[PDB]
Amino acid sequence: VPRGSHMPEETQTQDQPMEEEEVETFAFQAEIAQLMSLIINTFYSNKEIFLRELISNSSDALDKIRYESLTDPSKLDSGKELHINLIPNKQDRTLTIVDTGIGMTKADLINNLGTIARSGTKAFMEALQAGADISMIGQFGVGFYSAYLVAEKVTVITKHNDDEQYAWESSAGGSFTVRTDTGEPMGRGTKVILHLKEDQTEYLEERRIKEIVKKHSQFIGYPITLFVEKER
Ligand SMILES: Nc1ncnc2c1ncn2[C@@H]1O[C@H](COP(=O)(O)CP(=O)(O)OP(=O)(O)O)[C@@H](O)[C@H]1O
Numbered sequence: 001v002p003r004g005s006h007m008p009e010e011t012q013t014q015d016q017p018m019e020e021e022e023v024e025t026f027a028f029q030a031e032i033a034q035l036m037s038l039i040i041n042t043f044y045s046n047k048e049i050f051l052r053e054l055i056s057n058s059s060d061a062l063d064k065i066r067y068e069s070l071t072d073p074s075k076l077d078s079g080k081e082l083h084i085n086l087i088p089n090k091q092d093r094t095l096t097i098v099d100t101g102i103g104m105t106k107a108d109l110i111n112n113l114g115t116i117a118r119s120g121t122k123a124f125m126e127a128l129q130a131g132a133d134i135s136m137i138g139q140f141g142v143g144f145y146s147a148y149l150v151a152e153k154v155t156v157i158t159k160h161n162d163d164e165q166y167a168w169e170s171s172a173g174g175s176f177t178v179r180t181d182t183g184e185p186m187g188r189g190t191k192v193i194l195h196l197k198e199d200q201t202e203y204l205e206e207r208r209i210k211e212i213v214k215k216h217s218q219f220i221g222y223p224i225t226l227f228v229e230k231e232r
């Protein structure tokens with residue numbers, strides 16, 4: 001049956017086998033849930049410090065690369081630059097903080113971002129109740145959750161040398177999921193994707209991002225780059 005030319009629908013290759021992703025749901029530690037609720041549902045005028053916190057954690061992760069190299073000099077062989085990228089997406093209303101730090105293994109996500117008590121949580125909630133600036137969150141060891149000052153939902157994609165890629169995700173309300181992430185390989189590090197609340201879209205603006213990096217994150221110790229989508 002001679003063919004001279006095939007239509008794209010005819011030549012369209014079979015899909016790869018359908019990937020399976022294991023998803024687990026966890027309760028936040030009680031006080032973490034209480035903090036998240038508090039952060040989410042209280043007005044704070046100094047919300048911008050959320051970025052200082054997430055950049056600080058990227059920073060920490062990036063320092064650990066340097067130190068882990070002292071026991072694991074193999075890491076020295078990586079060609080990836082140690083850096084943070086800030087990626088605002090006006091179309092998706094997301095702000096992404098990407099680092100090339102050490103990343104987090106599956107159990108690191110579960111333990112570090114929600115199941116394990118932080119000892120400063122109760123004091124932080126009390127401080128807030130007595131009218132502390134939200135900025136103080138940095139000194140009470142719960143700074144990650146500042147993400148929820150600006151974000152209705154947070155997704156963390158992460159890849160650590162010792163594990164596969166995972167996605168952590170929470171819209172708060174007391175639980176979070178962790179699933180294997182068989183999607184876009186991201187290489188070692190972590191990507192924190194903030195789905196911004198409708199009225200926190202100033203944090204997609206390049207000038208505003210620049211202002212708060214300059215104000216709050218001047219000692220990263222690693223290049224930070226802001227990716228700005230050309231306006232069409
Ligand atoms: N970008 C990132 N890369 C790797 N690990 C990250 C990360 N962001 C968060 N984490 C993990 O999440 C944990 C909790 O972060 P935070 O809530 O900011 C408290 P911390 O930064 O560990 O304490 P500290 O600021 O009192 O030192 C970190 O300890 C780290 O294990």
Ligand SMILES: [Mg+2]
Pocket residue numbers: 053056057143144
């Ligand atoms: Mg921190």
